[PDB]
Amino acid sequence: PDRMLLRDVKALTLHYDRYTTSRRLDPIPQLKCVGGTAGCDSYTPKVIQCQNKGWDDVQWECCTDLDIAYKFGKTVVSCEGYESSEDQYVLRGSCGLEYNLDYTELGLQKLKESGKQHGFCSFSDYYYK
């Protein structure tokens, strides 16, 4: 069962540490951040679940638990067409998700008050060892 009809797939569970399957292309991470106002160097989700919400090009809704400082920007699901990129069947395990991570309104206000530092000194105790 290597080919599967896209419309018969209930749901996708995509991991930041697993790779997609591929025949014509190159395997890529199932889950990858590619931009947004928060960028990708810091916080990133590890697992995201997409549910099939209808056909037309299936409509995916991809959800995860995010720290309230972050929100999803644009997100694209893509899978590998089985016999060609114009195929209606897709290769099993080929689906992946790219996402943009934005700062929420609260994230922005928290950004404004973050990163501040102060010089802190302490009079240490000493013991000979």
Added chain:
Amino acid sequence: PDRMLLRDVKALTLHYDRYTTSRRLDPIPQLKCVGGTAGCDSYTPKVIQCQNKGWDDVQWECCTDLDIAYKFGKTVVSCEGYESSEDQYVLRGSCGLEYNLDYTELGLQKLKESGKQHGFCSFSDYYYK
């Protein structure tokens, strides 16, 4: 040689990723977090400078730039006495610092409003690759 009066050691620059010298003991990191209300498994300074301000017991003032949510708790400097633990000469490069890392009032308030999450969904775009 490898032997100097602690009295003469004016300044120390201690690194989180460097080890002390040792003869009688085991080499340990120049800089180790050991406790405090903030704990050690999170934010840690990498470099701490200490300045000798007098002897009586000898007194060290250890300073670094800290994120404002954090402050030093008790800090302890200790060097390996050369001929023994009773010796006023110490082994060159054997001085190290352990510190407790506490939350400031600001840090505690930021803790009270941190770690909250929301379920975020996104209606993804789709395309065949």
